[PDB]
């Protein structure tokens, strides 16, 4: 009864791979050989943001491109102001084992989460910061959470399931199961209609926020996926994995496009993020620094060395003015 | 230069101050321990007194120890253990009585030792259930030779210190487990960490003192290495 279904799944997979091969007329690398090179994109640390007393595990730029919140194991969830290097808020975290943080698109809210398996929501704009909500129910640790709005939050978890939560109601409205390994990162689409997520099974799956089940699943990576982010166009995304390879998948093509890796690089990626145009694919490796890529050329076009310890988080502003990288050296650097 | 700008700068100053006092009050004279092992082990019963992720804060001599016990996550622990890359030690606990799971205990030990992020993290190896091991070996129904063929050519170490009451077969078995763990401990050591064996029982009360002395040695060796004295 199981062998027959396994054979059916095998033949559906064969059909899918045959369709992908048929659609693979030509690769972007082959179609772009005539493109002028971008050149060396050098970036300097504009405003170093020191003050965290321990390792920094995550960060999220604000939608105003000014207020970035950082989560660290020291127990703080500081909300920095990159323009003035002014810590607007310093939220004390009940569980020091934070692993992710997010900033609401409006700005009125900020979230955290980690090995406590609870997504804690905070009123960053309060009349009196208190613990606004204590969303619980996941069995595994929280890897990455994002805000659709002030009331809906999508949190990835280490129990292989990422769920959608109604903040005020207090329980998972929709649960997106399907991953066979721990989900490690999240990425919301520019239209906020779909979200992809790489997991600990080297696969990134596309979910519809409302429909509630996986739409497309991409399996091109070799090891655990640690980071993910849509292309600005919204029809593609890039994924960083422990195999030291950034991989550009396009949703419409339903298959790989490019591979961003070299024999020189051995450390895996902990954080990737597209630029405003999408021509740049800034990624953060374990080798104490970040590398700037070229999505069209698949050729590395700069580095972001300057961090003492491993780089854990990396994000670009919505207007793409500057990128902030948070590393284990307890320092946030904004690289414009 | 504006009033709002001055208020923001003052707020940043007080936030930095508050972070300062909070960090100096927390991180001073405290040490964090990650407690690992299996269910059948004395995972939650190592330190009998002074009792998602669990916690156990105990003090020996004016020094604070936070002993974390992750016991809520999934089986795949290759990811969430990256957070404990700064702890002073890892309190590994082994169920010496049951030899069947002892091989995967060795596998866990070798994976912890050779992990890139757990590389500079010493392990305070607590060989537990010593009394149960004693009754098992005295009964002799299960022979450790079946689960490990290297027991035949093994010999008890000369430096071994027999307890006042112990059968030589008990001593040979327990030190064979100890040496099987130190094989992995000494295979790939960058000198940045060391395994500290400590035969313990569920009724032992000196586990806190053992962890205190072992962490003292760990920090002393780290300081010597930092100051080039080692």
């Amino acid at each position, epitope marked *: 009864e199981l062998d027959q279904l396994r054979q059916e799944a095998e033949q559906l*997979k064969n059909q899918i791979r045959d369709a992908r091969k048929a659609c693979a007329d030509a690769t972007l690398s082959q179609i772009t050989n005539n493109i002028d090179p971008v050149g060396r994109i050098q970036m300097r640390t504009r405003r170093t943001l020191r003050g965290h007393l321990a390792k920094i595990y995550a960060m999220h730029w604000g939608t105003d491109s000014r207020l970035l919140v950082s989560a660290s194991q020291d127990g703080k969830l500081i909300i920095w102001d990159s323009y003035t290097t002014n810590k607007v808020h310093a939220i004390p975290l009940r569980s020091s084992w934070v692993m992710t943080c997010a900033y609401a698109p409006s700005g009125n809210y900020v979230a955290c989460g980690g090995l406590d398996n609870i997504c804690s929501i905070y009123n960053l704009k309060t009349r009196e910061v208190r613990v606004s909500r204590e969303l619980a129910g996941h069995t595994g640790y929280l890897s990455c959470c994002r805000f659709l709005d002030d009331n809906q939050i999508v949190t990835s978890s280490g129990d*292989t399931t990422c769920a959608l939560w109604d903040i005020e109601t207090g329980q998972q409205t929709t649960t997106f199961t399907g991953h*066979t*390994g721990d989900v490690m990162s999240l990425s919301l689409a520019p239209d906020t209609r779909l979200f992809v997520s790489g997991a*600990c*099974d*080297a*696969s990134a799956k596309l979910w519809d926020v409302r429909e509630g089940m996986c739409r497309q699943t991409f*399996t*091109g*990576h*070799e*090891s*655990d996926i640690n980071a993910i982010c849509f292309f600005p166009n919204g029809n593609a995304f890039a994924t960083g994995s*422990d*195999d*030291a390879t950034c991989r550009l998948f396009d949703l419409r093509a339903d298959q790989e496009l490019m591979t961003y890796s070299h024999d020189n690089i*051995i450390c*895996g990626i902990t954080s990737v993020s597209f630029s405003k145009s999408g021509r740049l694919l800034l990624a953060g490796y374990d080798d104490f620094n970040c590398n700037v890529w070229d999505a069209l050329k698949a050729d590395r076009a700069g580095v972001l060395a300057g961090h003492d310890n491993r780089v854990s988080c990396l994000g670009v502003t919505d207007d793409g003015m500057a990128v902030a990288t948070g590393s284990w050296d307890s320092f946030l650097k904004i690289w414009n | 230069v504006s009033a709002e700008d001055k208020a923001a700068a003052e707020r940043s100053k007080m936030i930095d101050k508050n972070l300062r006092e909070d960090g100096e009050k927390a991180a001073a004279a405290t040490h964090r321990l990650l407690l690992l092992g299996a269910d059948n082990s004395g995972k939650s019963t190592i330190v009998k007194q002074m009792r998602g992720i669990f916690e156990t804060k105990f003090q020996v001599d004016k020094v604070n120890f936070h002993m974390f016990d992750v016991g809520a996550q*999934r*089986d*795949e*622990r*290759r990811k969430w*253990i990256q957070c404990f890359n700064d702890v002073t030690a890892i309190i590994f606990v082994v169920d010496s009585s049951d030899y069947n799971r002892l*091989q*995967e205990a060795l*596998n866990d030990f*070798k*994976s*912890i*030792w*050779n*992990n*890139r992020w757990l590389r500079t993290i010493s392990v305070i190896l607590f060989l537990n259930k010593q009394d149960l091991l004693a009754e098992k070996v005295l009964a002799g129904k299960s022979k450790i030779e*079946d*689960y*490990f*063929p*290297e027991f035949a050519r093994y010999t008890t170490p000369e430096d071994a210190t027999p307890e006042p009451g112990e059968d030589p077969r008990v001593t040979r078995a327990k030190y064979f487990i100890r040496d099987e763990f130190l094989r992995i401990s000494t295979a*790939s050591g960058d000198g940045r960490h060391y395994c500290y064996p400590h035969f313990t029982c569920s009724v032992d009360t000196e586990n806190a003192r053992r962890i205190f002395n072992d962490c003292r040695d760990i920090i002393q060796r780290m300081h010597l290495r930092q100051y080039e004295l080692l």
Partner: nanobody
Framework: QVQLQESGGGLVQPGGSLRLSCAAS????????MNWVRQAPGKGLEWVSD????????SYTGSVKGRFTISRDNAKNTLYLQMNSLKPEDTAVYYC?????????????????????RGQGTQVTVS
């Protein structure tokens, strides 16, 4: 896709030999430390054999030390485990599960119940 399809095994009387092989695709096989974890019916998954990235460091679990032998062919992308002089207790399903990270020696989580990069399995029956 990282897929591990196993081949070989079957039925054999005690003391027999059945070489196990599994084709590996979707990854650079020569960069991942390999394993041969098994699962007996009614018992949890048991790690049996091991190899190095280049086949230098080789380790075996005590219950089958010497009787079994692992070997890796990078060009063939196949992991070979030679079990000679089988025992009735060897009856189990065998997985040639690799371990997630490349360029590393620590295979941290392989014998987990829902490991992502493990093979389909070969049921070897010894009676």
């Amino acid at each position: 896709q990282v897929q591990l399809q196993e081949s070989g095994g079957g039925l054999v009387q005690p003391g027999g030999s059945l070489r196990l092989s599994c084709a590996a695709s979707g990854f650079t096989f020569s960069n991942y430390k390999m394993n041969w974890v098994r699962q007996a019916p009614g018992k949890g998954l048991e790690w049996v054999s091991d190899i190095s990235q280049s086949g230098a460091s080789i380790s075996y679990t005590g219950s089958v030390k010497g009787r079994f032998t692992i070997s890796r062919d990078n060009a063939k992308n196949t992991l070979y485990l030679q079990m000679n002089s089988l025992k009735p207790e060897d009856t189990a399903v065998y997985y040639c599960a690799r371990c997630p990270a490349p360029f590393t020696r620590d295979c941290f989580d392989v014998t987990s119940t829902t490991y992502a990069y493990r093979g389909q399995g070969t049921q070897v029956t010894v009676s």
